[PDB]
Every structure is written in C-alpha cells, then in structure tokens.
Amino acid sequence: THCVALCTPRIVIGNLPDGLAPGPFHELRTWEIMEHMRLRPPP
Amino acid sequence: AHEYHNWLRSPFSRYSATCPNVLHSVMTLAAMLYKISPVSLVLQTKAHI
Amino acid sequence: AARRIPHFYRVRREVPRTVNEMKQDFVVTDFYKVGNITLYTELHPFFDF
C-alpha cells in the first residue's frame, strides 16, 4: 500500500482476494480436505 | 484390551461410526462377518461371491 | 470384575496408538505413499503382524 512504501504480510491464505482465490475455490479446498482428513459430520 | 486376541477388530468400529442408517448397512455388518477359511473361499466362489 | 475399570481410568496413563488403530486413518490413494508408516507391518493377506 502507498501510505512512502509499506509492506504488510498476508498471514493466512484468506487475505488473497477474489480474482486470485475465489470463494468456490476455497470451498473445493474444504471438499478436498474433507476427503483427505477422513472427517464425517456427526449424526 | 486385546485387539490382537479377539474376533471383532477396529475396522468394524471405524466403518460403523459413519455408516448410513438403512437395512443395507446392517447387511454390510452381516457380510464383513464372512470368515476367511479355505472352505469359505470355495463356497464363496461356488455361488459367485 | 466390574470394579477395577474406574481404577484403570483413574490413572492418567494414555495408551499409545496401536498398529490396527493407525492402519485405518488413511484414504485409499494415500495408503500407497511413503507417508503411510504402517506399510512395514502389513505382510500377509490372511494374517496380521
């Protein structure tokens, strides 16, 4: 950002915006970690 | 706690924790109770199992 | 012999995860990887080791 330069680290993956990482892309990420961590919803 | 001296081991719980609740899953727990013996292999072969 | 099980749970000893418990926590396509560390024990299709 132009505050003089400024460097702010995006700590988690979520600070990447749309057009770089959309919502359904993260939703498919949750689908593949649903398959990959053997997690099942409670009865 | 003798999982290596009993009959019904940990895959039985590991499947049945997350099974759908139909009569078909009761049949799944019925059919994985099929023993592994040579006579069982011949008779499973003989009727196309 | 139902009176000695709260004694077993009274001590805070935790059991390490045995082989047949760490053999179910993998999906079928991750089972053939080197990340599956229980591959050196699965030897016979009839017998467990």
PDB file of N, CA and C in Angstrom, chain B residues 3-4 9-11 14 36 41, chain C residues 18-21 24 45-46 48:
ATOM      1  N   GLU B   3      -6.890 -56.405  21.120  1.00  0.00           N
ATOM      2  CA  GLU B   3      -7.359 -56.257  19.748  1.00  0.00           C
ATOM      3  C   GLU B   3      -6.671 -57.249  18.824  1.00  0.00           C
ATOM      4  N   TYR B   4      -5.612 -57.896  19.305  1.00  0.00           N
ATOM      5  CA  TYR B   4      -4.928 -58.953  18.581  1.00  0.00           C
ATOM      6  C   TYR B   4      -5.152 -60.315  19.221  1.00  0.00           C
ATOM      7  N   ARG B   9     -12.311 -56.587  15.285  1.00  0.00           N
ATOM      8  CA  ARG B   9     -11.244 -55.614  15.470  1.00  0.00           C
ATOM      9  C   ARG B   9     -11.684 -54.220  15.020  1.00  0.00           C
ATOM     10  N   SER B  10     -10.724 -53.295  15.008  1.00  0.00           N
ATOM     11  CA  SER B  10     -11.022 -51.870  14.850  1.00  0.00           C
ATOM     12  C   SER B  10     -11.661 -51.408  13.529  1.00  0.00           C
ATOM     13  N   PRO B  11     -11.472 -52.053  12.358  1.00  0.00           N
ATOM     14  CA  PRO B  11     -12.264 -51.635  11.182  1.00  0.00           C
ATOM     15  C   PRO B  11     -13.772 -51.736  11.351  1.00  0.00           C
ATOM     16  N   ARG B  14     -14.613 -48.578  12.959  1.00  0.00           N
ATOM     17  CA  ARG B  14     -14.214 -47.467  12.106  1.00  0.00           C
ATOM     18  C   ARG B  14     -15.163 -47.282  10.927  1.00  0.00           C
ATOM     19  N   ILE B  36     -12.551 -65.969   6.865  1.00  0.00           N
ATOM     20  CA  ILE B  36     -11.561 -66.337   5.859  1.00  0.00           C
ATOM     21  C   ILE B  36     -11.026 -67.726   6.171  1.00  0.00           C
ATOM     22  N   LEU B  41     -13.653 -69.938   1.096  1.00  0.00           N
ATOM     23  CA  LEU B  41     -13.251 -69.451  -0.218  1.00  0.00           C
ATOM     24  C   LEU B  41     -13.881 -70.280  -1.331  1.00  0.00           C
TER      25      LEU B  41
ATOM     26  N   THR C  18      -2.054 -48.202  18.700  1.00  0.00           N
ATOM     27  CA  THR C  18      -1.505 -49.475  18.247  1.00  0.00           C
ATOM     28  C   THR C  18      -1.582 -49.542  16.723  1.00  0.00           C
ATOM     29  N   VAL C  19      -1.090 -50.650  16.158  1.00  0.00           N
ATOM     30  CA  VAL C  19      -0.956 -50.791  14.709  1.00  0.00           C
ATOM     31  C   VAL C  19      -2.323 -50.813  14.034  1.00  0.00           C
ATOM     32  N   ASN C  20      -3.291 -51.516  14.628  1.00  0.00           N
ATOM     33  CA  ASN C  20      -4.597 -51.641  13.987  1.00  0.00           C
ATOM     34  C   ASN C  20      -5.432 -50.373  14.147  1.00  0.00           C
ATOM     35  N   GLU C  21      -4.977 -49.419  14.964  1.00  0.00           N
ATOM     36  CA  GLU C  21      -5.653 -48.126  15.006  1.00  0.00           C
ATOM     37  C   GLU C  21      -5.023 -47.133  14.037  1.00  0.00           C
ATOM     38  N   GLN C  24      -6.183 -47.484   9.989  1.00  0.00           N
ATOM     39  CA  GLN C  24      -7.483 -47.057   9.496  1.00  0.00           C
ATOM     40  C   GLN C  24      -7.578 -45.571   9.188  1.00  0.00           C
ATOM     41  N   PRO C  45      -2.053 -61.418   3.542  1.00  0.00           N
ATOM     42  CA  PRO C  45      -3.490 -61.131   3.414  1.00  0.00           C
ATOM     43  C   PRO C  45      -4.357 -61.896   4.392  1.00  0.00           C
ATOM     44  N   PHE C  46      -3.883 -63.026   4.916  1.00  0.00           N
ATOM     45  CA  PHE C  46      -4.629 -63.800   5.896  1.00  0.00           C
ATOM     46  C   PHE C  46      -4.267 -63.472   7.334  1.00  0.00           C
ATOM     47  N   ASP C  48      -2.112 -61.062  10.380  1.00  0.00           N
ATOM     48  CA  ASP C  48      -1.636 -59.737  10.737  1.00  0.00           C
ATOM     49  C   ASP C  48      -0.383 -59.856  11.589  1.00  0.00           C
TER      50      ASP C  48
END
